[PDB]
Amino acid sequence: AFAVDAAKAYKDYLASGGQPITNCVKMLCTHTGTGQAITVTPEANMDQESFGGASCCLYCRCHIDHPNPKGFCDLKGKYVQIPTTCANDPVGFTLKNTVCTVCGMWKGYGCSCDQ
Amino acid sequence: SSQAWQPGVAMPNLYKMQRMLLEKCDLQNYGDSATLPKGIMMNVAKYTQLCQYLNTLTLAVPYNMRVIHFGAGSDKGVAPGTAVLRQWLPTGTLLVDSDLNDFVSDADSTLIGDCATVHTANKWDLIISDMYDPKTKNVTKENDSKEGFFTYICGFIQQKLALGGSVAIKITEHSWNADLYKLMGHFAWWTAFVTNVNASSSEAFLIGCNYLGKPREQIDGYVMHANYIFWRNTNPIQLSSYSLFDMSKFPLKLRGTAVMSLKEGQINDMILSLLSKGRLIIRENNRVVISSDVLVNN
Ligand SMILES: C[S@@+](CC[C@H](N)C(=O)[O-])C[C@H]1O[C@@H](n2cnc3c(N)ncnc32)[C@H](O)[C@@H]1O
Ligand SMILES: [Cl-]
Ligand SMILES: [Zn+2]
Ligand SMILES: [Zn+2]
């Protein structure tokens, strides 16, 4: 029942003081967007940067199978918004954080559905 | 210069009417760098200015618009230009990209391999090409018309570009083709566009706007490339990134341009008039099928 867990391998490489994956495609935008995590068009707000989805996907970048039964990708063809404070490692940010299913913002980075 | 606030500079009409001899390109800006917004790649800035400029033309923009992008990969293994085209094109637009080398894209579909192995049953509304071979830059030989992928691009425009469609093909002092200049005469309007962020490069985008399928003016490719070099040698362009700080009017407006599947014996003068204004696209509206040839040899 073997299978390569790349998400864990990258986190272990980051904790080991490794260099984050670079060349993530940062987009030009007004920075007056919704602030939602993954969008069809850049929706960065003043506290965020928008990136090309494919360039921020660990699976797409390492050319390995996606952890989705049909081998489908969430980021490819979309735009992922990353807090300006974490834009130094967008791939690592998408692996560690979760998208709120009711408002669409990142958990603990905009999602306020818990108040 | 009020051109600093433009996304780039188009070749003035008076330079297109000359008969100059091909000379070496010698830019005064050469070696300079534009101040890019923090963390933005050159190709994101470059494609953004190209798109800002295309927003000013009579592009046909139908529903389910079909766009193909050649030379979309990079040494980094990502497709910065494709990400900008995805941001620029209206939702529901089909975006297919291709490159000789493996790369990761935001396109609906990506084909890997020589552009000569790419086949497609259907026609396209817009063709973008950033295909370039650094070998072509040779100052120890004559600067002659180049073939390679240009031969494929010329056949692709003539047989797969929808009437009313437009193209943006990247050229340089040495990466150019005489037949591609000749073909710009088959469009309602054409120009050579230089982005302000790369104004220090002999690079330019030949823009054919609204394909008529027949020659409107007779263009000598050798003479026109000589005219392009003369324009670049005599008109220094101030490097500028000003147009990049205002993205409020960036997205291409969906005009819902009409798509008709007309036969060739029906193209009258009143139809060519609608193609010229960017108010009509002529191609089948069938499903999109693409394929990559695989040469098998053990
Ligand atoms: C300037 S790079 C393209 C950069 C890309 N537009 C970007 O956004 O970064 C030129 C590309 O043309 C590709 N190319 C050159 N000759 C080709 C050919 N005959 N068929 C397909 N791709 C080709 C190269 O592999 C290279 O990736
Ligand atoms: Cl060159
Ligand atoms: Zn992916
Ligand atoms: Zn929420």
Element containing residue B275 per DSSP (H, E): helix B269-276
Domain boundaries, chain B: 2-298
Query: Tokens in use for B45?
Result: 């800035």
The DSSP 8-state label assigned to residue B278 in this structure reads T
Tell me the CA distances in angstroms from B83 to A56, A76, A85, B126, B174, one per residue in order: 12, 10, 23, 16, 28
Active site residue B293: no
**Check: CATH 3.40.50.150 for B2-298?**
yes
| Structural resolution in Å | 2.2
Contacts of B44 in chain A (CB under 8 A): 25-28
Per the CB < 8 A criterion, the answer to whether B94 and B285 are in contact is no
Per the CB < 8 A criterion, the answer to whether B100 and B93 are in contact is no
Per the CB < 8 A criterion, the answer to whether A78 and A26 are in contact is no
* Nearest alpha-carbon partner for B224 in B8, B12, B15, B10: B15
Q: Quote the CA–CA distance of A104 and A40 in Å, as a whole number.
A: 13
Active site residue B203: yes
* Nearest alpha-carbon partner for B73 in B99, B95, B108, B96: B99
Ligand nearest to the CA of B170: 1
Q: Quote the CA–CA distance of B48 and B88 in Å, as a whole number.
A: 8
Query: Any alpha helices (H) in B55-207, and if so which ranges?
Result: 80-88, 149-160, 178-183
Q: Quote the CA–CA distance of B283 and A54 in Å, as a whole number.
A: 31
Q: Is the CB of B97 under 6 A from ligand 1?
A: no
Which technique was the structure solved with, according to the deposited record? X-ray
Nearest CA to ligand 1 atom 2: B74
Q: Quote the CA–CA distance of A10 and A14 in Å, as a whole number.
A: 6
Nearest CA to ligand 1 atom 4: B74
Distance from CA of A24 to the nearest CA of B (A): 8
Domain boundaries, chain A: 1-115
Burial A17-32 (b: 16+ CB within 10 A, else e): eeeebeebbbbbbebe
Q: Of these residues, B97, B125, B130, B173, which one is catalytic?
A: B130
Query: Tokens in use for B254?
Result: 């969906």
Q: Which of residues 36-75 of A touch B (CB under 8 A)?
A: 40-42, 49, 52-55, 57, 60-61, 63
Q: Is the CB of B149 under 6 A from ligand 1?
A: yes
3-state secondary structure of A96: helix
Contacts of B17 (CB under 8 A, 6+ apart): none
Q: Quote the CA–CA distance of B127 and B219 in Å, as a whole number.
A: 21
